[PDB]
Design a protein around this ligand. Structure first.
Ligand SMILES: CC[C@@H](Cc1ccc(OC)c(C(=O)NCc2ccc(Oc3ccc(F)cc3)c(F)c2)c1)C(=O)O
Ligand SMILES: CC[C@@H](Cc1ccc(OC)c(C(=O)NCc2ccc(Oc3ccc(F)cc3)c(F)c2)c1)C(=O)O
Lengths: 264, 264
């Protein structure tokens, strides 16, 4: 159908326009020159070049694990802004009640964040700082608990997600499907959201048939990844709560505090 | 450092002196009275007042899309002259081999042009004709293909670039960083250019820390905008080639023909 073929392109176009990183761009960088962060020496070097404001305090600077945690949060905050503008190209999203738009983004942003993080991850590490650094997975594993425990589950998810070999045309529809879940708690107009979601899911199913004819199960596999991402976020929010309670130096950004507030 | 603080000011001063339009000036005009070009009637009116020589041929005049294309090129040619004189205040630029100065300007001018165009653009249109007109983005979208396709990608870039809220002190250093890229094809003294570039990039990093303490990622964001601008120019040059081959009325200015010659 031409209207559905266009809906898929509108959403893909909105994705390419609103996210600073996409999978084609990430793959070009990941092939090879981002500065490699693989130990404490190179973390401190990268900090002086890529985030110099943070380490300009002398002995007042925070422990390395907490600086990394802060920089991960700053990355998330940026992605929430990108996700918020992308959400307007989903048909009917801007016609939803303003409160419903807030609730959908509230529960969807971290599922979308972890899905899209896969695009900049490989089995050895991930791009950081707008593509200018690459931090190794082994370095992130080396951080003291509980900060190391934030990281590896996201790689575990991404390695299996990346094995599906989706492209940006697929992932844009997937992220839109994540944002339009009609079973989020607190929704006012559930019925309208379900019809909005059904239209996107309908385009996602047809698109996957067209773009991945070799994988007859790809649509139900992606439905399962959405459920897996919900569980990943529930687990992530618990671990973030442990850090907030037990690490007095690891302040939560206020935008992320509101996202987490009464989430799970 | 006082020498670096002075290098940043020397480059800012060179920017304010050599460009006819700067962002403060553009913002004052954009607030409000430039003549508004929003349809064919008002394009023809503006032409008689602001570019009267071009439409003084009667039925010999060119189709409106081609007149606009010509006037955009005339704007570019002017900006290349401005960029060429600005480039002298970059430390070491005038000490480079004359051939290297040519190569740097060759690959840098359009990246700088599109970065600086953002200063006169908003989501509704852009200033034209030395600040005396404002042409609407919707009008530019309304031009027949392929001429409409020249325009909107530049607005897409500018809307995200403008969201960074840079000022002229930032943009002058950014444009200098663009011109001193040591990875341009054809360079004779790559090493000297890399050291020249490192000095400007070093001042840009410290300046951004000083002028935007609120945005710890601003320097890597701008590194990414430089890469985005290179891709924008590659795409622009392809579209210009399509126009040259398929629109016999749309002559390329000779200065711009030489810039494009063997570029990408
Ligand atoms: C706090 C948890 C988040 C969710 C979350 C979970 C897992 C992640 O990755 C596995 C990521 C994430 O963003 N990884 C990219 C990244 C990694 C290191 C960074 O640190 C630096 C430090 C210095 C540098 F010079 C460059 C990078 C960084 F800045 C970004 C985010 C939240 O709850 O919002
Ligand atoms: C040919 C492509 C260029 C690159 C390029 C690409 C995109 C652009 O903007 C999105 C611009 C540009 O200059 N926009 C300002 C502008 C717009 C319309 C104009 O037309 C008139 C016409 C009558 C008037 F009375 C007043 C203005 C004009 F004169 C300047 C330039 C090249 O390849 O060099």
């Amino acid at each position: 159908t031409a209207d559905l073929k266009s809906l898929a392109k509108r959403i893909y176009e909105a994705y390419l326009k609103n996210f600073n990183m996409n999978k084609v761009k990430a793959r070009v960088i990941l092939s090879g020159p981002p500065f490699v962060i693989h130990d404490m020496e190179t973390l401190c070097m990268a900090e002086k070049t890529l985030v110099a404001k943070l380490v300009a305090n002398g002995i007042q600077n925070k422990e390395a694990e907490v600086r990394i945690f802060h920089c991960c949060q700053c990355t998330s905050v940026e992605t929430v802004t990108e996700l918020t503008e992308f959400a307007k190209a989903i048909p009917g999203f801007a016609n939803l009640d303003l409160n419903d738009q807030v609730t959908l983004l509230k529960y969807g942003v971290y599922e979308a964040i972890f899905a899209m993080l896969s695009s900049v991850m490989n089995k050895d590490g991930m791009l950081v700082a707008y593509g200018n650094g690459f931090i190794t997975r082994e370095f992130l594993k080396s951080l003291r608990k509980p900060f190391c425990d934030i990281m590896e589950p996201k790689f575990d998810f991404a390695m299996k997600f990346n094995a599906l070999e989706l492209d940006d045309s697929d992932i844009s529809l997937f992220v839109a499907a994540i944002i339009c879940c009609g079973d989020r708690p607190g929704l006012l107009n559930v019925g309208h959201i379900e019809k909005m979601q059904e239209g996107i899911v309908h385009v996602l199913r047809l698109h996957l048939q067209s773009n991945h004819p070799d994988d007859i199960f790809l649509f139900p596999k992606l439905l399962q990844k959405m459920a897996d991402l919900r569980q990943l976020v529930t687990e992530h929010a618990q671990l973030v709560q442990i850090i907030k309670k037990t690490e007095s130096d690891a302040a939560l950004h206020p935008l992320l505090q509101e996202i987490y507030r009464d989430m799970y």
